[PDB]
Design a protein around this ligand. Structure first.
Ligand SMILES: *[C@@H]1O[C@H](CO)[C@@H](O[C@@H]2O[C@H](CO)[C@@H](O[C@@H]3O[C@H](CO)[C@@H](O)[C@H](O)[C@H]3NC(C)=O)[C@H](O)[C@H]2NC(C)=O)[C@H](O)[C@H]1NC(C)=O
Lengths: 93, 96
């Protein structure tokens, strides 16, 4: 797609889980249901405004679910809870 | 001829080792488990992958799999305890 330097898909939303966090655990899997209902709203927001960039949910468990789905970009050390946009919204100065 | 003469002290040092093996079984029966990374302390968390830092450097990370594995010389049963106690009595690797 244009206006997106990668290959993307609007059918669903991708899920990023950091290397040091094991997928399939009880906490992650429970977190992995109720975030699946966000895909409908992810589609709805894009329909109203086609010129919309990444919409991402940074969970307190560690996993980040973003839309539209796109494969992730050495080893991976990305953690959604350490990003500048997560930190400013999780507390005050 | 000498073997049969030293057979009285062999029956004693073998019987005495068995009691210590049973005591060791009572004490450390399944307590010698550990994960690959020293951050997870039970089999539930010791799953998946983890980031290992070579030789303590925080700038050289490598991805490794964490496995909940037993010790080589454990006290799970009376035989592993007897073998570990034999290795200790040979004074080899006993500090570990
Ligand atoms: C967490 O994951 C669960 C397993 O995937 C979900 O539970 C199942 O969701 C299905 C999809 O809605 C349900 O199927 C239908 O549900 C409707 C509504 O009650 C009913 O018509 C029937 O129960 C069912 N239809 C059938 C079977 O033809 C399942 O009933 C439901 N429960 C199961 C499989 O035990 C959860 O929805 C999901 N949680 C969230 C928040 O998404």
């Amino acid at each position: 797609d244009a206006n997106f330097g990668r290959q993307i898909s609007y059918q669903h939303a991708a899920v990023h889980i950091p290397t040091d966090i094991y997928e399939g655990s009880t906490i992650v899997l429970n977190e992995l249901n109720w975030t699946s209902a966000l895909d409908e709203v992810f589609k709805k927001n894009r329909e109203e405004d086609p010129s919309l960039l990444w919409q991402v949910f940074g969970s307190a468990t560690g996993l980040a679910r973003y839309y539209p789905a796109s494969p992730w970009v050495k080893i991976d050390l990305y953690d959604v809870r350490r990003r500048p946009w997560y930190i400013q919204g999780a507390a005050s100065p | 001829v000498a073997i049969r003469t030293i057979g009285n002290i062999m029956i004693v040092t073998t019987l005495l080792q068995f009691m210590f093996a049973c005591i060791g079984v009572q004490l450390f029966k399944g307590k010698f488990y550990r994960c690959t990374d020293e951050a997870k302390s039970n089999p539930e968390e010791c799953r998946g992958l983890f980031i290992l830092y070579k030789d303590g450097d925080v700038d050289s990370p490598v991805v490794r799999e964490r496995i909940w594995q037993n010790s080589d010389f454990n006290f799970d049963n009376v035989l592993s305890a007897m073998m570990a106690l034999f290795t200790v009595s040979t004074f080899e690797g006993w500090p570990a």
